[model samples]
Target chain A: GYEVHHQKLVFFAEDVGSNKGAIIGLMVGGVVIA
Target chain B: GYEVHHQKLVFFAEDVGSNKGAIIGLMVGGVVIA
Candidate 1:
C-alpha cells in the first residue's frame, strides 16, 4: 500500500546504469539507525 | 574519554558529498572485527 507519513515523501529508485545517458539525478542516501 | 573499541577499529569513511558520501570506498561502515 502507498501512503504518505508526516508530510514526508518516501520512495525507492533503481540505478538505471550508464544508459539513457545517466543524468546523475539527485544522488540521495542515508544511514540506518536502530 | 573518547575511548577506542579495544578489540578493533570502528570507523566510517565516505565521499562527504551527501549523507551518503560520508566516506568514499566504503558503503556504510561498521565495527571492524578480528
Candidate 2:
C-alpha cells in the first residue's frame, strides 16, 4: 500500500513592449507513513 | 505584472526488513496570466 504526491510550478518572462512567455513545471513522488 | 507558483513532491523507499527512507523535494516559479 502506497500513496503518491504531486505538485506544479509555473514561470513567465516579459519583454519591454508586449511580448511574454510562460512555462510550467511539475513534480511527483511517493511516501510511507505507517 | 507577475505571479508566483510553487509545489512540492515526496518520495519513499522500503526494504524487506522493515527499513525505509523518505525524501521530499520542492519547486517554485513565477508567471503572468493577464
Candidate 3:
C-alpha cells in the first residue's frame, strides 16, 4: 500500500500496476536536511 | 529558498523561474501523518 523512504523517512505510495510511484501529498525540495 | 508545509512541515523547493516548483528529494505519499 505504501513505503517509507529510509533516507528521509518519507512515505511513497505503491501503484497497483507495475509502474513508477509518486509522492501523494507532503513533499520537500532542496538540499538534504541535516 | 524553500517553504515548509504548514500541515506537515514538509519542505518545498521554489523554482528559479516564474513557474511551478517541485520537491527536491524527500517526499511522502498516502494519508497525511498526523
Candidate 4:
C-alpha cells in the first residue's frame, strides 16, 4: 500500500490509470515472465 | 540484451555498475517477495 523510489528505479503497488494489481509485467515485450 | 523505457518507468536487464543478473529486487524494503 505504498511506493519505492530507489535511484533511477521505482517500485510500487498502487494503481495506475485503471491497471490495478501487482507489478508483475512481462519480459516477452521487456516485462514479466511465466 | 535490451532496454525498456515505458513512459515514466523503465525496465532493463543489462548491467548496473557492478550489480549484474536479473532485475529481481526486494520487498524487504519493498522489492522481491519469496
Q: Compared with the true structure, what per-residue lDDT tens digits does model 1 show for residues B8-30?
A: 32222212222321222233334
Q: For this target, which candidate reaches the highest TM-score against the unseen true structure?
A: 2
Give the share of true interchain contacts found in each model. Answer: 0.00, 0.06, 0.04, 0.02
- For candidate 1, the docking band is incorrect
Off by over 4 Å in 3: A1-15, A21-25, A30-34, B1-34
Which CAPRI quality tier does the interface of model 3 achieve? Answer: incorrect
For candidate 2, the per-residue lDDT at A7 reads 61
DockQ of the candidate models in sequence: 0.03, 0.05, 0.05, 0.04
Q: Report the lDDT of model 2 for residue A23.
A: 19
lDDT of candidate model 1 versus the reference: 0.28
Clashing pairs in 1: B13-B23, B14-B22, B14-B23, B14-B24, B15-B23, B15-B24, B16-B21
Under CAPRI classification, how is model 2 graded?
incorrect
C-alpha local distance difference test of each model? 0.28, 0.29, 0.32, 0.36
- Clashing residue pairs, candidate 3? A28-B11, A29-B24
lDDT of 4 by residue, A1-34 (tens): 4443443544433333332233343323333321
- The alpha-carbon deviation from the true structure for residue A14 of candidate 4, after best TM-score superposition, in angstroms, is 24
State the lDDT of candidate 2 residue by residue for A1-34, as single tens digits.
4443446432222212222332122333322232
* Candidate 4: tens digits of C-alpha lDDT, residues B1-34: 4443434544434333322233443322333322
- Evaluate model 4: give its lDDT: 0.36
